[PDB]
């Protein structure tokens, strides 16, 4: 039962560094070298470097020169990832180990640790109702309403329609950065049912303890 337990996600400021953790278990920690891999949405997976707990120290990837100076510690079988500068280092970092003795392929991986670099502070989201121009209800047999959530930090926010009773025809999209995470959701129902049968989006933001239930109404 080989297992690698990584650390919870952290939100460092665009300036300092953060030491990540990886608790190996189920095998003699010193018998295998630990590896670290980075994964960003646009650049894919990139190997960072390895470490020998038996002590052969390290060997880093050219690209992660001093921005990543690994370290470890026996008597606890945990490996650490320093992360120096940090600013464009926002991504998920993995802890990886190989399986057999003669293949550098990574058979064992940690669950990964998300790292977000931002100077923003906890901020409640503004929620904006999206209704078809001039109220009405479209021009077909179906009408689409929406909810725009922006200016919040940090992730995440939960969004439902009519307290969850409206789940079909819903499209809720991944939030995108921009100082204040912004996301949106659309709901599509039968034209004759709105505004006859009310529709409200419920947005909740754990970090700020805030919730907003914005009803969607015809507008001019």
């Amino acid at each position: 039962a080989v297992h690698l337990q990584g650390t919870e996600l952290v939100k460092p400021g665009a300036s300092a560094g953060v030491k990540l953790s990886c608790k190996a278990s189920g095998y003699t920690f010193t018998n295998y070298d630990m590896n670290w891999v980075r994964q960003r949405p646009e650049q894919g997976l990139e190997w960072i470097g390895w470490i020998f707990p038996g002590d052969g120290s390290t060997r880093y990837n050219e690209k992660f020169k001093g921005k990543a100076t690994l370290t470890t510690d026996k008597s606890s079988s945990t490996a650490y990832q320093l992360n120096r500068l940090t600013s464009e280092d926002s991504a998920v970092y993995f802890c990886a180990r190989r399986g057999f003795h003669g293949s550098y392929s990574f058979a064992y991986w940690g669950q990964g640790t998300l790292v977000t670099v931002s100077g923003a502070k906890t901020t409640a989201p503004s929620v904006y109702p999206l209704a078809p121009a001039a109220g009405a209800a479209g021009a077909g047999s179906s009408v689409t309403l929406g909810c725009l959530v922006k200016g919040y930090f940090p992730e995440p926010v939960t969004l439902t329609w009519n307290s969850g009773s409206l789940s079909s025809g819903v499209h809720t999209f991944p939030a995108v950065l921009a100082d204040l995470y912004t996301l949106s959701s659309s709901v599509t129902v039968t034209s004759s049912t709105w505004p006859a049968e009310s529709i409200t989006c419920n947005v909740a933001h754990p970090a700020s303890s805030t919730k907003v239930d914005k009803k969607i109404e015809p507008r001019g």
Partner: protein, 214 residues
């Protein structure tokens, strides 16, 4: 640095069918190559070690071949849970490098996007903000081009796009495109258009509205 190239970011397949992902190492990495699979929000899973060896527990449907500069991952008969990302990785000489990955997706009937455009809400305008939102939902193939036009001229500054992966139920894709201006600039223009170019129609799908005009 050796460069692993996976020429296909996405590959259309079907359940019960055969599919082959290809990888091309910039150099002869001999047989030092591994294949990984990854599902959203999870870590990579080793599927193949040393070019063509199944790791333990990896089902017979998964196969890999090649040795030299060209390698190929193959799935005899695709199953629902195989519609994920597969990564190539050479471990011949450091630094270890991974391919860009290939996402397998379910092929289905072409479907035109339903496009909806929304003017800024009064509540946002009071805060000095003006976001125009455009939804493009339930379309297939994923290939789509969204353009914004303000008073006719195309606008690229201030556009933020978001999309969902292929739906696990209806195999379509959806997308949101938001044009965010300040109320100051928003009120200095009159015509706002969201234009979707998709293979399902010769003419791009267009949705618009005029400030203050119903």
């Amino acid at each position: 640095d050796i460069v692993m190239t996976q020429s296909h970011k996405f590959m259309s397949t079907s359940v019960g069918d055969r599919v082959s992902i290809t990888c091309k190492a910039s150099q002869d990495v001999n047989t030092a190559l591994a294949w990984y699979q990854q599902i959203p929000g999870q870590s990579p899973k080793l599927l193949i070690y040393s070019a063509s060896n199944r790791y333990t527990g990896v089902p017979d449907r998964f196969t890999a071949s090649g040795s030299g500069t060209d390698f190929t991952f193959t799935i005899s008969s695709v199953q629902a849970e195989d519609l994920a990302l597969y990564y190539c990785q050479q471990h011949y000489t450091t630094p270890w490098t991974f391919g860009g990955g290939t996402k397998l997706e379910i092929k289905r009937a072409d479907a035109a996007p339903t496009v909806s455009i929304f003017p800024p809400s009064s509540e946002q305008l009071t805060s000095g903000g003006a976001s125009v939102v455009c939804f493009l939902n339930n379309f297939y193939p994923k290939d789509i081009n969204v353009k914004w036009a303000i008073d006719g001229a195309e606008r690229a500054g201030g556009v933020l796009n978001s999309f969902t992966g292929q739906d696990s139920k209806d195999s379509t894709y959806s997308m949101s495109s938001t044009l965010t201006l300040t109320k100051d600039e928003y009120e200095r223009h009159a015509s706002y258009t969201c234009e979707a170019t998709h293979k399902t129609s010769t003419a791009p799908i267009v949705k618009s509205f005029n400030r203050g005009a119903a």
